Each structure stands twice: as C-alpha cells, then as structure tokens.
C-alpha cells in the first residue's frame, strides 16, 4: 500500500477509536 | 486526493481529542 | 533512523492493540 | 515539522494512549 493509502486507513481507525471512546 | 500534510493534520487532531478524552476517563 | 514505512508499520500495530483493548474494556 | 518527525510524534501519542487505556481497564 502507498503511504497515502496507509495514512488514510490510520485516520479511519482513529475516527473509530474516538467514536467508541465518546460513548463511554 | 488529500495531501499527506492535510491527512497528518487530521490524524494529529484526532489523537489530541483521544488523549484528552482518555485522560478525562482516567480521572478518579 | 526509521524509514517512513517502518514508522507506519509501528503505528499500525499500536492501532491494532488499541482497538483490541477497546472491545475488551470493562 | 518534517513528515518523519510528525510520524514519530504520532507513534509517541499512540504509546501514551495505550498506557491510558491499560490504566482505565
């Protein structure tokens, strides 16, 4: 995967993590 | 087709929010 | 020191560990 | 900051996040 695609995936995982933490 | 620097800026903002929220959750 | 790709690999593994802990919290 | 320095800082923040999650559990 390109660096750009990898960073996009990292951003998506961070969005998920943040969403889960906000429900606590 | 976002630039790498713009993607890093978004990642950095999300990390900052995650850290602030986790510290808040850890308050006794 | 680390190449950009090696740093990304480390970041990706830490994210997997974080997500794994979130599903098993409490 | 260079991209390499920004990624190093991101990695450090992720390590801190892991520590905070471990304490929370």
Author numbering:
A (entry chain D): 170 to 193
B (entry chain C): 169 to 196
C (entry chain A): 169 to 194
D (entry chain B): 170 to 194
Which passages does the manuscript contain on this structure?
The essential polymerase cofactor P from Pneumoviridae is a multifunctional hub which interacts with numerous components of the viral RNA-synthesis machinery. Pneumoviral P interacts with both L and the nucleocapsid, thereby tethering the polymerase to its template. In HMPV and RSV a central oligomerization domain facilitates the formation of P tetramers. In summary, we have shown that HMPV P is a highly dynamic protein that is composed of a stable helical tetramerization domain flanked by large N-terminal and C-terminal IDRs that sample a large volume in solution and display varying degrees of preformed structural elements.
Although we were not able to grow crystals of a complex, crystals which later proved to harbour only the P oligomerization region could be obtained after extended time periods. Serendipitously, we obtained two additional crystal forms of Pcore with improved resolution, allowing us to build a higher quality model (100% Ramachandran favoured). The first crystal (form 1, space group P21) diffracted to a resolution of 1.6 Å, while the second crystal (form 2, space group P212121) gave rise to diffraction data up to 2.2 Å. The P21 crystal (form 1) of HMPV Pcore grew at 20 °C after 291–344 days with mother liquor containing 20% polyethylene glycol (PEG) 6000, 200 mM NaCl, and 100 mM Tris, pH 8.0. Diffraction data were recorded on beamlines I03 (P21 crystal) and I04 (P212121 crystal) at Diamond Light Source, Didcot, UK. For the 1.6 Å data of crystal form 1 we additionally carried out anisotropic atomic displacement parameter (ADP) refinement. Mapping of the sequence conservation within the Pneumoviridae onto Pcore reveals the strict conservation of the hydrophobic amino acids (Leu and Ile residues) lining the interior of the coiled-coil, indicating that all family members share a similar P oligomerization region (strictly conserved residues in purple). Furthermore, Arg175 is strictly conserved in all Pneumoviridae and plays a role in stabilizing the quaternary structure of the tetramer by forming a salt bridge with either an Asp or Glu on the neighbouring helix. Alignment of all six tetramers from crystal forms 1 and 2 and the original crystal confirmed that there are small-scale breathing motions within the coiled-coil. The ability of the C-terminal region of P to stabilize this α-helical structure might explain its absence from the crystal structures of Pcore (as the P constructs used for crystallization required C-terminal degradation in order to yield diffracting crystals, which in turn destabilizes the cap-like structure).
